Ligand binder design. Structure first.
Ligand SMILES: *[C@@H]1O[C@H](CO)[C@@H](O)[C@H](O)[C@H]1NC(C)=O
Ligand SMILES: *[C@@H]1O[C@H](CO)[C@@H](O)[C@H](O)[C@H]1NC(C)=O
Lengths: 49, 48, 43, 214, 48
C-alpha cells in the first residue's frame, strides 16, 4: 500500500529499523518528530476530519 | 532552535517550488536559457 | 490460513547511500502488522 | 576557489544507439496500437537526428535538443506510429482532441521529444492499413477507423512520427551522449560531471561503505 | 499595421497599436526572404 515510512539508516548505511507512520498514534508521533525515541509530552501529530 | 532553523533552511533547497527539478544544475544541463529562466525564477522565488 | 507480517518487508526505496540518519520516504510498502496469506508447496 | 579544470565521467561503453532501426522501419504502427522500442547500453548522438533535413519538426519538452548530447539517461523509449499532418499538433503534453485522448495521451509532465515528418512519398498509394480511434495507454459496438492516404491528399497527408521519452532515474546510466570521458582528479577543486550529474567540488577518496547497488 | 498585405505583424515588448505614442533613439529594420514555414523561427527564444 502507498505509505509514509521513517527509515533508520545506521553508520554503515544499511536500513536497521523503520516506523510505519500510519500504524498507530505513537508511530505518527515518531514520524512527526522524525525520531524513534519520544520524550514525555503532548504532540500535535495530525489533524482529523 | 538554532540547529532546527538551519536544518530547515538547508532542507528547503530540496524543494521544487514548482520548477521541473529542485537542482539548479539539472535545469542548466537540460534546458536552454529562454525556457530555463522560467524554472529558475520559481527556485529564486522560493529560496528567497 | 493467515500469519502476521510483523515488521518484515521494508526495502531500500532508492539507489542512494545515507548514514546515521532518519529518512521519511513514502512508497508502496507492506504495512506493519498486516496479515499475509499463507500457502503450502505440498500437504 | 574557482574550479581548476573540468572532469567528465561517462560509462565505459561505445556502441552507437539503434535509432536508424526506428527511423527507417518498413511500417510505422497503426496509432490506436502504436509500437515502442527501448534503447539501452549504447552511445546516443542526437545531433545526427536534429541536423537532419528529413524532419518537418523536432520539438522537445523538459530538455532542449541543443543539450541532448550532454545528458546521460538510464533508458530511452521510442514510440513509432503514423497520423494525418494536422494531428502532429495533438502530439504534445496537455493537448485536447481525438489523438490527444482516444489513442495517444502523453503525460502532463512529459520529458522527451516529438519528431515528425511528412511521408506522402511512401505511406500514400489509396492505402487504408493505418488504423486509428490514460498516459501511454494503448487503446486496442466499439470505435475502429483507418486513414485513407493517396499522394493527391497538406493536412490530410500521412506524417510519420517518433516520440522519444527520456528516463532521468538515479540508476546506472546506459543511453549517453557522445561527450567523451576525461581522467579522474582527486584532492583538487574541479568542475566534475558523473553521468550528467554536474557540480563543483574537491573530489577526494572516501572510507564510506556503499552497498553494491548504491 | 492597417495594411491587408502583412500575413503576420507579431510585436514583442511593445503593442502595434501603441507605437504612435513612442519615440525611439533608433529604429533598425532587418530585411530578408525565408520560406513561409520558418516565419515561426523569427522570434525571441525560438529555435531551428
Ligand atoms: C559496520 O561495518 C564494520 C566493518 O564492516 C563492522 O565491523 C561493523 O560490525 C558494522 N556495524 C554494523 C552495526 O553493521
Ligand atoms: C536511414 O537510412 C539512410 C539511408 O540508408 C541512412 O543514411 C540514415 O543514417 C538512416 N537513419 C538514421 C537515423 O540513421
Amino acid at each position: 500500500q502507498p505509505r509514509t515510512f521513517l527509515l533508520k539508516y545506521n553508520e554503515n548505511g544499511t536500513i536497521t529499523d523503520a516506523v510505519d507512520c500510519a500504524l498507530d498514534p505513537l508511530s505518527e508521533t515518531k514520524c512527526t518528530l522524525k525520531s524513534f525515541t519520544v520524550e514525555k509530552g503532548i504532540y500535535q501529530t495530525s489533524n482529523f476530519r | 532552535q538554532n540547529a532546527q532553523a538551519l536544518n530547515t533552511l538547508v532542507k528547503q533547497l530540496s524543494s521544487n517550488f514548482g520548477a521541473i527539478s529542485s537542482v539548479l544544475n539539472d535545469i542548466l544541463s537540460r534546458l536552454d536559457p529562454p525556457e530555463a529562466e522560467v524554472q529558475i525564477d520559481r527556485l529564486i522565488t522560493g529560496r528567497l | 490460513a493467515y500469519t502476521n507480517s510483523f515488521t518484515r518487508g521494508v526495502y531500500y526505496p532508492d539507489k542512494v547511500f545515507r548514514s546515521s540518519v532518519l529518512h521519511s520516504t513514502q512508497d508502496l510498502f507492506l504495512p506493519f502488522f498486516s496479515n499475509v496469506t499463507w500457502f503450502h508447496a505440498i500437504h | 576557489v574557482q574550479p581548476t579544470e573540468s572532469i567528465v565521467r561517462f560509462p565505459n561503453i561505445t556502441n552507437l544507439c539503434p535509432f536508424g532501426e526506428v527511423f527507417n522501419a518498413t511500417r510505422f504502427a497503426s496509432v490506436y496500437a502504436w509500437n515502442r522500442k527501448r534503447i539501452s547500453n549504447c552511445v546516443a548522438d542526437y545531433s545526427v537526428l536534429y541536423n537532419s533535413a528529413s524532419f518537418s519538426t523536432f520539438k522537445c519538452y523538459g530538455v532542449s535538443p541543443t543539450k541532448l548530447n550532454d545528458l546521460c539517461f538510464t533508458n530511452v523509449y521510442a514510440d513509432s506510429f503514423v497520423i494525418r499532418g494536422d494531428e502532429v499538433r495533438q502530439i504534445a503534453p496537455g493537448q485536447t482532441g481525438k489523438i490527444a485522448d482516444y489513442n495517444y495521451k502523453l503525460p502532463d509532465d512529459f520529458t522527451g521529444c516529438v519528431i515528425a515528418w511528412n511521408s506522402n512519398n511512401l505511406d500514400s498509394k489509396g492505402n487504408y492499413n493505418y488504423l486509428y480511434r490514460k498516459p501511454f495507454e494503448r487503446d486496442i459496438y466499439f470505435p475502429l477507423q483507418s486513414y485513407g492516404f493517396q499522394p493527391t491528399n497538406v493536412g490530410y497527408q500521412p506524417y510519420r512520427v517518433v516520440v522519444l521519452s527520456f528516463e532521468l532515474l538515479h540508476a546506472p546510466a546506459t543511453v549517453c551522449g557522445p561527450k567523451k570521458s576525461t581522467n579522474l582528479v582527486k584532492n583538487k577543486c574541479v568542475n566534475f560531471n558523473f553521468n550528467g550529474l554536474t557540480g563543483t567540488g574537491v573530489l577526494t577518496e572516501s572510507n564510506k561503505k556503499f552497498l553494491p547497488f548504491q
